[PDB]
Write a protein that binds this ligand. Sequence first.
Ligand SMILES: *C(=O)C(CC)(CC)C(=O)Nc1cccc(CN2CCN(Cc3ccc(Br)cc3)CC2)c1
Ligand SMILES: *C(=O)C(CC)(CC)C(=O)Nc1cccc(CN2CCN(Cc3ccc(Br)cc3)CC2)c1
Lengths: 804, 804
Amino acid sequence: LEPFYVERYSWSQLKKLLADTRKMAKAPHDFMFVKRNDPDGPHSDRIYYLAMSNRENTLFYSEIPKTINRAAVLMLSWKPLLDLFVGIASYDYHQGSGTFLFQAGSGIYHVKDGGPQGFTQQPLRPNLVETSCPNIRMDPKLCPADPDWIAFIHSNDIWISNIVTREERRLTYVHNELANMEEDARSAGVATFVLQEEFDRYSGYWWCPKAETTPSGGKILRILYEENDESEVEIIHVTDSFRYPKTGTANPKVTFKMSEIMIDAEGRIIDVIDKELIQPFEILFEGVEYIARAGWTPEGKYAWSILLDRSQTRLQIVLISPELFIPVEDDVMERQRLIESVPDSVTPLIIYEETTDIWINIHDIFHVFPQSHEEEIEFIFASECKTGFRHLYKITSILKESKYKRSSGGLPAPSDFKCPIKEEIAITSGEWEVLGRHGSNIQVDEVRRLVYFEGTKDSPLEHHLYVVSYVNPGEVTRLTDRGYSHSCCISQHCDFFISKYSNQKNPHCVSLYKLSSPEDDPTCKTKEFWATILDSAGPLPDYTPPEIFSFESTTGFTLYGMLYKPHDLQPGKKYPTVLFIYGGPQVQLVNNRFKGVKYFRLNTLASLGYVVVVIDNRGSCHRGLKFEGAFKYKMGQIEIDDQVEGLQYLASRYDFIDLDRVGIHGWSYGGYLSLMALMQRSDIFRVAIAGAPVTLWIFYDTGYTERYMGHPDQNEQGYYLGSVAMQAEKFPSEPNRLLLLHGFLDENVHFAHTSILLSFLVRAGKPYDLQIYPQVPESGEHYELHLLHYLQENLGSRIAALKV
Amino acid sequence: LEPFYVERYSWSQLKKLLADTRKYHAKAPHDFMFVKRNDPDGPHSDRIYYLAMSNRENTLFYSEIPKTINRAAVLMLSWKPLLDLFQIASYDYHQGSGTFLFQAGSGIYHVKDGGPQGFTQQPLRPNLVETSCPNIRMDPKLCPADPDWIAFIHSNDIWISNIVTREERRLTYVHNELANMEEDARSAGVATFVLQEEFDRYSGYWWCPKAETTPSGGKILRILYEENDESEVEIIHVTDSFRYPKTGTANPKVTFKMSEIMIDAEGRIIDVIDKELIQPFEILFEGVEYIARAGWTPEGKYAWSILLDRSQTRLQIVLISPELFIPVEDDVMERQRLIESVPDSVTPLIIYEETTDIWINIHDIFHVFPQSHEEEIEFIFASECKTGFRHLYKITSILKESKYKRSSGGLPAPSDFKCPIKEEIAITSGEWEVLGRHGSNIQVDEVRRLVYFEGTKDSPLEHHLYVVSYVNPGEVTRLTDRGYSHSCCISQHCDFFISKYSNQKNPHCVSLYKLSSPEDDPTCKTKEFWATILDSAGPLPDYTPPEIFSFESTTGFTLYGMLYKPHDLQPGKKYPTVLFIYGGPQVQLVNNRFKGVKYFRLNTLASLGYVVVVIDNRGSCHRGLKFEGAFKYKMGQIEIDDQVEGLQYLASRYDFIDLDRVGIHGWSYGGYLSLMALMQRSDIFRVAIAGAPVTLWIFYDTGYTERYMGHPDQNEQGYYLGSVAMQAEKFPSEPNRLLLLHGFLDENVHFAHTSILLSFLVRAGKPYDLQIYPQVPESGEHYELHLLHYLQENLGSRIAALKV
Ligand SMILES: *C(=O)C(CC)(CC)C(=O)Nc1cccc(CN2CCN(Cc3ccc(Br)cc3)CC2)c1
Ligand SMILES: *C(=O)C(CC)(CC)C(=O)Nc1cccc(CN2CCN(Cc3ccc(Br)cc3)CC2)c1
């Protein structure tokens, strides 16, 4: 077996090869179905969605016909909703009025369609909500109880504004804009860094969905909101500063607050009264670090919240009445009556609690049914804690009076607020998970008593839509067709669903499917193709996809992988190998989806004469909690074994793989593992190429690394062995093997990780190559050019072998 | 001619090689002072105090100068430690009392020796100057009028302290340590960044050398000081804040202040009166931007200052009477009363003014004789503005009353303060310069009416000590021996001089020389070796020194260079050349000094089989102002021509030079020219290694850049052509030719320079290599290791030749 050598292109030649092969907007999303209610008309519903037609992301609509010509395929035409000459990231809507509310760059706008007014046949002019606020307004939301009232964040304080009457008013006075960030670190209604970046919670205030009518003729509106104090949180810089809770250090001091807003009969604000918790957050919510999720029950009786402890091994779903909040009062004497007056039976209600010895994965599945009984709450939740796979559970919890009393003046023990679990039925089960992250959620048909959900049941390589009864869980019907991975949303009316779908050979496609039942059985569901929303681009003419392989690992698990064979493969020749890797939690690289957009250059590597390989090691997602928990306290230690094992599987199966010329490359956690690969297994990996690597886990934030490695004090050995900067001596003492890539202005994986590794590489007397991208297509073009040229000169070409 | 290729060592072998050649390898005695013993029975005439080292702290030593020597033998002066080790970079001294003052770590200490109290025979214990000041005290100075009083700087304000009574007091209230430096950017008695970095002025206050006695039996002590406001100056951050005046942008607002301190008969402070100039600085000193130097006349009658304009083409010497300062008064009537109280005859006295079409070079030479006439002042100054070479000039200026009167209410016209010149005599002349920087200065013997000075009269490759009369200047006697470059100081008594000397073959020695006259003529001076202070290490066996060469350039100047011939030079073989370079203003690499300490590694390159070349192109110092003025407005445009001309001279003279394997390397301005070399002349230079280079003149400071390039608006093309980051597309599209080296925390040539270059190299599609030193001997050893390997792999070795 002779060694294949890649063509030794010059720098200018390689650049021209990439500019030619290089020569992709956001697919329709955030769908919403509105019924026409016109017996005489041809359409049943109108759908609204956000999409990109190099254009602005904007609102569109399409008409859903009552019947279709089944010999033909219906292409829905995209009608623009807005009359334009930046982008809309998201939008709010209110069914009873037809009111849209959205943000577009610097402005908060509104229009009306599909309400009691009716349906437009032409683009609508966006109506600016006028303001006196100097700076940018963020996170706008319609009040569900009254669509004339919006809310938004301005300079870390909550504001409200009436779109009809032009009235505007600040609700919180927690921050001053002229004051600097070091002295003033408080905020209201805003999710802080860690909750946005590690828990995917972006809003920090929640409109109460119902209005309480006052005897006078007016009404009371409410806003639950978190208030944050980041004073004791660590500060860091980059070429102004921000608050980054480094692992083992302080997270922000949190609490819940209620803004109570009084309006008269004419829609004019009578007064605003900010209210705080009757006892501090630490007392009521013992051991809780993070407010992971929050909201209200359907009728606004209780606020709810999903609460985590610091270690993220204890989760709590807690109901919170508005009666628990009392006015923020100056005078302690006037205040003391307000505390005593609140009854002792009015308590926080921990309606659900669970624990794990691995970690809690937060998700967006949580559905609360209407209250049939004052003493009970009925809801669907998802959890991995019972079986190690995420499954839907229908739960009923009794709302009994707490044994603890506030008049006694004592402090409450852990279990004082626990509610008894009356019922707890498993809706789903098996060796596969329900998806609750990144848009995946449930849709609950309350009439037919069904629940739609996305799952890995048919394969860990494909997401599919399913439906099941929640009253008597039996058969789970798959609604999406096999051979594609899907991403779906279901109409609020539960008679339609849309799927964004693709597989390895075919680019993404968006289609509408009508749902039906047989007359005899409403429980049973069938689907029928209705129309195309976005047609597939067609198979890319010069992109050759990889083959999804697998193998039975010594670890017990099956491990899946992608293999790009070298193009124009000559028999009796062995080829240089490039291992691409991410390998960290919350990500799966290997699945039946189209990879020719993001990972197009893995094809390009195959075209040059490289064997590209991707392998999802233990710790990757969509394989259950036990699979994910394999590296708890052991980040860096187990991942390369999996990668090497899968690499050796392919080597004995395919002798076109040269094991002597193996390179590895990854970004972020992939860069981390690329460095570990060169440190631990230099016998296997000739070159490592680390992009934005994590080199030292004490430099990373609380929410992420404490979940997977615990508090640093309790795991000095795990933090040591998993940090590459504290093991610089283990890198090779020969150059052209280690390449570091990093942006200067990196917000997640700071340049500190790179420069501390560099600082320790200099101590150890070890060689490295470095590239920087100080601020953009230009950087990406240069990265790919430099990367290919590096693999050529130090791995693939004939000079590569002669260099050693 | 066969090409020689260097032996391709591994990274471990090179590290080892460097470690062994380093294994065989301290501040030489400096800041000397001669104190007379005054004992007609003792064996010693003088004791000499000096700062010196032996990896030890730099500390004060003393040595005994004997009245006679054994003239056959050679006397080694033994170093007696003056201080007892603690439970020093500079020092102050009071002759009449024998008081030493110096900062050592956080503390300011004092001891007594060589005064009335006599001479110690053992080390003294340093006495701490006690303080209530929280922060570190800087720049301690003794009041020459009273040795009980010191001044120091603390949190950018001036303080004083009495070392007998322990009274401590704050004189200025200009800065608040609590306030952040965006708000608080004022300082008192401190030289700002540009004046420390580009003019070598470190102190910003000056004690008046005499005390004015009061009627009560007390006295008035005085301190002249500069007050700086840096509010309008540009700020930069480096991984704390910096006030960095970028070229074309604002320098600090400056003024002179005067602090009148009233002391009673028993040495207690009665009062402190802060005093400002009668009219603002801009009115009294029209056109002045920089306070370059300042002090007092010997009798404390006037303050003097050397004032520069922004272009640095006008130098003034002004006398500033203490009568020009009135107290600070917020009250408007009280202040207006004080202006009219000062006579109109009290005026700034511009005793000297010069101009040039090139630039003013600031120096430390300025000597004022005792005032005989109240309307005449006599002084020695040095200047290049007459002949183009720096020479000593004795001047007598007449102190007439100005024509401008403060009562008339107008503003002074630009020459109203200019004194007439009664006499101006050249003490020296010729095609060579007097040295006035980096310790070089004059010593004026006022009895014999001679001036001792250092200069380049015998050669531009050696500094020598000379003496000449200032009354009837004729014969200039060289006092130092040929075949060595010298750095000297003369005893205040003018009967001794010390020389720190070396040459190309011999490491540095420090020897003492006694001065005498023949009995018939005190004007004539002879020298005799007296004793050694520091013995030579001897020629080191490892180190082969370079040969100095010269060539007659086409530009009309002789240009000098150094040549390291390869070690074990083979017949019929051509070797790879490394051109090492600085090539910027104020520096001379090529002279008859020992280069085996700092430039040892140029010898190491010759031991590996490289030809090493150093050439002092036009712009270098020690060749007069015309030679230096070559690149006026044209930095980066002429330097490489001279380098390439000198290299071609050596090539046709020596067949062992391989002109197809030339690399270039340098730091700071040498890194700049290394980039320019690869950009302008890719034909000659294969590889360029640029260390901490200026890539953009608009990012460098005012004091340096505007001196040589003028203001950017006056020189659009020079700034474009001279800034390499503006011309990234002119770099090669072959990799392994450009290596950038930079520290991350550099505060002179900032990382900004490299990061913007990288941005434009990335945007232009050009390859580069990069190494960083995030903060130390480790950094240096890795730099050397990487630099030898980089040249091996990309210029010298066999693989390098194949790699093209
Ligand atoms: C890591 O998680 C972060 C954020 C997602 C943060 C540190 C990161 O930095 N991601 C990041 C940085 C730079 C570029 C990308 C996009 N990435 C590049 C690699 N590409 C595969 C590939 C492209 C070209 C060639 Br040649 C080989 C391989 C996938 C997309 C992400
Ligand atoms: C430039 O003037 C500055 C400040 C003095 C500011 C940018 C500077 O950075 N100087 C600087 C940086 C780093 C190292 C030095 C010391 N310098 C290195 C080169 N050396 C000669 C040499 C050593 C090794 C080899 Br291999 C070849 C040549 C002289 C000392 C200065």
